[PDB]
Amino acid sequence: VLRGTGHCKWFNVRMGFGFISMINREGSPLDIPVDVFVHQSKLFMEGFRSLKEGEPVEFTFKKSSKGLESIRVTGPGGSPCLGS
């Protein structure tokens, strides 16, 4: 279980998932961003779960055979995500 921070790259509510651009990993700025998969079920917020393109996020994630995958995604300071 690693942590990172960055921003929603895209999120498609019809698909129920999207990607986060990670720009900081384990507390270190990255020289090139790396994307992280995010499914609606992992979004920390009340009511309908989505992300808005560009919204800033903090998250835990893991490695898998299908790229990096988020475990739990919040807005800044662990606050709820905003969504679209």
JSON list of C-alpha atoms in Angstrom, two decimals:
[
{"chain": "A", "resi": 1, "resn": "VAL", "atom": "CA", "xyz": [0.00, 0.00, 0.00]},
{"chain": "A", "resi": 2, "resn": "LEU", "atom": "CA", "xyz": [1.68, 3.18, -1.22]},
{"chain": "A", "resi": 3, "resn": "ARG", "atom": "CA", "xyz": [0.42, 6.77, -1.10]},
{"chain": "A", "resi": 4, "resn": "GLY", "atom": "CA", "xyz": [0.49, 9.54, -3.68]},
{"chain": "A", "resi": 5, "resn": "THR", "atom": "CA", "xyz": [-1.10, 12.80, -4.66]},
{"chain": "A", "resi": 6, "resn": "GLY", "atom": "CA", "xyz": [-2.10, 14.44, -7.98]},
{"chain": "A", "resi": 7, "resn": "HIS", "atom": "CA", "xyz": [-5.30, 15.27, -9.80]},
{"chain": "A", "resi": 8, "resn": "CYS", "atom": "CA", "xyz": [-8.11, 13.52, -11.64]},
{"chain": "A", "resi": 9, "resn": "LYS", "atom": "CA", "xyz": [-7.04, 13.01, -15.29]},
{"chain": "A", "resi": 10, "resn": "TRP", "atom": "CA", "xyz": [-10.51, 11.89, -16.45]},
{"chain": "A", "resi": 11, "resn": "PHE", "atom": "CA", "xyz": [-13.52, 10.08, -15.01]},
{"chain": "A", "resi": 12, "resn": "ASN", "atom": "CA", "xyz": [-16.39, 8.60, -16.95]},
{"chain": "A", "resi": 13, "resn": "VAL", "atom": "CA", "xyz": [-19.52, 8.14, -14.81]},
{"chain": "A", "resi": 14, "resn": "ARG", "atom": "CA", "xyz": [-21.11, 5.84, -17.44]},
{"chain": "A", "resi": 15, "resn": "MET", "atom": "CA", "xyz": [-18.06, 3.58, -17.15]},
{"chain": "A", "resi": 16, "resn": "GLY", "atom": "CA", "xyz": [-17.84, 4.23, -13.43]},
{"chain": "A", "resi": 17, "resn": "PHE", "atom": "CA", "xyz": [-14.06, 4.70, -13.47]},
{"chain": "A", "resi": 18, "resn": "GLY", "atom": "CA", "xyz": [-11.21, 6.88, -14.77]},
{"chain": "A", "resi": 19, "resn": "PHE", "atom": "CA", "xyz": [-7.57, 7.75, -14.10]},
{"chain": "A", "resi": 20, "resn": "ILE", "atom": "CA", "xyz": [-5.66, 10.00, -11.68]},
{"chain": "A", "resi": 21, "resn": "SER", "atom": "CA", "xyz": [-2.43, 11.65, -12.77]},
{"chain": "A", "resi": 22, "resn": "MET", "atom": "CA", "xyz": [-0.01, 11.05, -9.90]},
{"chain": "A", "resi": 23, "resn": "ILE", "atom": "CA", "xyz": [2.64, 13.80, -9.59]},
{"chain": "A", "resi": 24, "resn": "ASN", "atom": "CA", "xyz": [3.91, 12.98, -6.06]},
{"chain": "A", "resi": 25, "resn": "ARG", "atom": "CA", "xyz": [4.60, 9.46, -4.84]},
{"chain": "A", "resi": 26, "resn": "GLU", "atom": "CA", "xyz": [5.42, 8.43, -1.27]},
{"chain": "A", "resi": 27, "resn": "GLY", "atom": "CA", "xyz": [5.96, 12.14, -0.48]},
{"chain": "A", "resi": 28, "resn": "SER", "atom": "CA", "xyz": [8.43, 12.78, -3.37]},
{"chain": "A", "resi": 29, "resn": "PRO", "atom": "CA", "xyz": [7.73, 14.90, -6.46]},
{"chain": "A", "resi": 30, "resn": "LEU", "atom": "CA", "xyz": [7.85, 12.73, -9.60]},
{"chain": "A", "resi": 31, "resn": "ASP", "atom": "CA", "xyz": [9.80, 13.99, -12.67]},
{"chain": "A", "resi": 32, "resn": "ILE", "atom": "CA", "xyz": [7.19, 12.52, -15.00]},
{"chain": "A", "resi": 33, "resn": "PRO", "atom": "CA", "xyz": [3.56, 11.83, -13.96]},
{"chain": "A", "resi": 34, "resn": "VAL", "atom": "CA", "xyz": [2.22, 8.25, -13.84]},
{"chain": "A", "resi": 35, "resn": "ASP", "atom": "CA", "xyz": [-1.42, 7.46, -14.06]},
{"chain": "A", "resi": 36, "resn": "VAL", "atom": "CA", "xyz": [-3.39, 5.48, -11.50]},
{"chain": "A", "resi": 37, "resn": "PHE", "atom": "CA", "xyz": [-6.72, 3.62, -12.10]},
{"chain": "A", "resi": 38, "resn": "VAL", "atom": "CA", "xyz": [-9.71, 4.77, -10.00]},
{"chain": "A", "resi": 39, "resn": "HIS", "atom": "CA", "xyz": [-13.05, 3.00, -9.79]},
{"chain": "A", "resi": 40, "resn": "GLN", "atom": "CA", "xyz": [-16.15, 4.75, -8.35]},
{"chain": "A", "resi": 41, "resn": "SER", "atom": "CA", "xyz": [-16.23, 2.27, -5.46]},
{"chain": "A", "resi": 42, "resn": "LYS", "atom": "CA", "xyz": [-12.93, 3.69, -4.09]},
{"chain": "A", "resi": 43, "resn": "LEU", "atom": "CA", "xyz": [-14.05, 7.39, -3.90]},
{"chain": "A", "resi": 44, "resn": "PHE", "atom": "CA", "xyz": [-14.39, 8.87, -0.37]},
{"chain": "A", "resi": 45, "resn": "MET", "atom": "CA", "xyz": [-17.55, 11.05, -0.59]},
{"chain": "A", "resi": 46, "resn": "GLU", "atom": "CA", "xyz": [-21.28, 10.99, 0.28]},
{"chain": "A", "resi": 47, "resn": "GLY", "atom": "CA", "xyz": [-23.95, 10.23, -2.29]},
{"chain": "A", "resi": 48, "resn": "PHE", "atom": "CA", "xyz": [-23.22, 9.66, -6.01]},
{"chain": "A", "resi": 49, "resn": "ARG", "atom": "CA", "xyz": [-19.48, 8.88, -6.44]},
{"chain": "A", "resi": 50, "resn": "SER", "atom": "CA", "xyz": [-17.47, 10.56, -9.29]},
{"chain": "A", "resi": 51, "resn": "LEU", "atom": "CA", "xyz": [-14.42, 12.71, -9.78]},
{"chain": "A", "resi": 52, "resn": "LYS", "atom": "CA", "xyz": [-14.29, 16.02, -11.70]},
{"chain": "A", "resi": 53, "resn": "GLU", "atom": "CA", "xyz": [-11.50, 16.35, -14.31]},
{"chain": "A", "resi": 54, "resn": "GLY", "atom": "CA", "xyz": [-8.62, 18.23, -12.75]},
{"chain": "A", "resi": 55, "resn": "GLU", "atom": "CA", "xyz": [-9.75, 18.04, -9.12]},
{"chain": "A", "resi": 56, "resn": "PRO", "atom": "CA", "xyz": [-6.85, 17.56, -6.68]},
{"chain": "A", "resi": 57, "resn": "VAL", "atom": "CA", "xyz": [-6.73, 14.17, -4.94]},
{"chain": "A", "resi": 58, "resn": "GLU", "atom": "CA", "xyz": [-4.80, 12.23, -2.33]},
{"chain": "A", "resi": 59, "resn": "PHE", "atom": "CA", "xyz": [-4.88, 8.42, -2.36]},
{"chain": "A", "resi": 60, "resn": "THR", "atom": "CA", "xyz": [-3.54, 5.10, -1.37]},
{"chain": "A", "resi": 61, "resn": "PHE", "atom": "CA", "xyz": [-2.75, 2.70, -4.25]},
{"chain": "A", "resi": 62, "resn": "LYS", "atom": "CA", "xyz": [-1.12, -0.59, -5.11]},
{"chain": "A", "resi": 63, "resn": "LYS", "atom": "CA", "xyz": [0.79, -2.24, -7.96]},
{"chain": "A", "resi": 64, "resn": "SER", "atom": "CA", "xyz": [-1.08, -4.90, -10.02]},
{"chain": "A", "resi": 65, "resn": "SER", "atom": "CA", "xyz": [-0.68, -6.64, -13.42]},
{"chain": "A", "resi": 66, "resn": "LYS", "atom": "CA", "xyz": [-2.93, -3.89, -14.82]},
{"chain": "A", "resi": 67, "resn": "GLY", "atom": "CA", "xyz": [-0.96, -0.90, -13.70]},
{"chain": "A", "resi": 68, "resn": "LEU", "atom": "CA", "xyz": [-1.27, 1.14, -10.53]},
{"chain": "A", "resi": 69, "resn": "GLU", "atom": "CA", "xyz": [-4.65, 0.91, -8.85]},
{"chain": "A", "resi": 70, "resn": "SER", "atom": "CA", "xyz": [-6.14, 3.24, -6.19]},
{"chain": "A", "resi": 71, "resn": "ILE", "atom": "CA", "xyz": [-7.45, 1.79, -2.93]},
{"chain": "A", "resi": 72, "resn": "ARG", "atom": "CA", "xyz": [-8.97, 4.88, -1.32]},
{"chain": "A", "resi": 73, "resn": "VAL", "atom": "CA", "xyz": [-9.16, 8.36, -2.90]},
{"chain": "A", "resi": 74, "resn": "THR", "atom": "CA", "xyz": [-9.87, 11.69, -1.06]},
{"chain": "A", "resi": 75, "resn": "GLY", "atom": "CA", "xyz": [-9.58, 15.41, -1.77]},
{"chain": "A", "resi": 76, "resn": "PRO", "atom": "CA", "xyz": [-6.83, 17.45, -0.13]},
{"chain": "A", "resi": 77, "resn": "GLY", "atom": "CA", "xyz": [-6.23, 16.85, 3.63]},
{"chain": "A", "resi": 78, "resn": "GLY", "atom": "CA", "xyz": [-8.36, 13.68, 3.49]},
{"chain": "A", "resi": 79, "resn": "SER", "atom": "CA", "xyz": [-11.51, 15.72, 2.78]},
{"chain": "A", "resi": 80, "resn": "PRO", "atom": "CA", "xyz": [-14.28, 14.32, 0.62]},
{"chain": "A", "resi": 81, "resn": "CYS", "atom": "CA", "xyz": [-13.87, 14.23, -3.19]},
{"chain": "A", "resi": 82, "resn": "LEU", "atom": "CA", "xyz": [-15.89, 16.88, -5.07]},
{"chain": "A", "resi": 83, "resn": "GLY", "atom": "CA", "xyz": [-17.08, 14.93, -8.10]},
{"chain": "A", "resi": 84, "resn": "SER", "atom": "CA", "xyz": [-18.83, 16.10, -11.21]}
]
